[PDB]
Amino acid sequence: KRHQLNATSVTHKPNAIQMALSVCEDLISSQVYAILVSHPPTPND
Amino acid sequence: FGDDTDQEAVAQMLDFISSHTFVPILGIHGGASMIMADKDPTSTFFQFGA
Ligand SMILES: *[C@@H]1O[C@H](CO)[C@@H](O)[C@H](O)[C@H]1NC(C)=O
C-alpha cells in the first residue's frame, strides 16, 4: 500500500534436516526472492 | 562424496549433514573438494583440498 508482492511463511521444524527439507520443498518451490528467518524461543544455538 | 559441479555451497551442505547424521564424509572432487573456513565442531566432515 505504501508504493504485486506476495508473502509466504512456515514455522520452525524440530529437526534441522527436516527444516531444510521443508524449506526448499515449500519455500523454494514457490520461487521466493528472499527468506526471513528468526530464532525460536527455545535456547538452541 | 565426489561431485563434478563447481558449486561451492554443496560442500557446506555436506558439513551440515555431518553435523546432524554423525556420519563421516570425505570430499573428493568438484564442490566437495572446496575447502571451507571453519566447520561446525560437531560435524565430522573432511576434505582433500588445501
Ligand atoms: C501467494 O502465496 C501463497 C502462499 O501459500 C500461495 O498460496 C498463493 O498461490 C500465492 N499467490 C499466487 C496467486 O500465486
Entry resolution in angstroms? 3.5
| Cell numbers at B21, concatenated | 547424521
Q: How many CA atoms lie within 13 A of A31 on its CB side?
A: 1
Distance set, CA A2 to CA A5, A9, A10, B33 (Å) = 12, 22, 25, 47
Q: How far is the CA of A1 from the centre of ligand 1 (A)?
A: 18
CA R_g for chain B:
10
Q: Which residues of A17-40 are buried (b: 16+ CB within 10 A; e: fewer)?
A: eeeeeeeeeeeeeeeeeeeeeeee
- Chain B hits for A16, CB-CB cut-off 8 Å, are 16, 19-20
Give the 3-state secondary structure of residue B45: strand
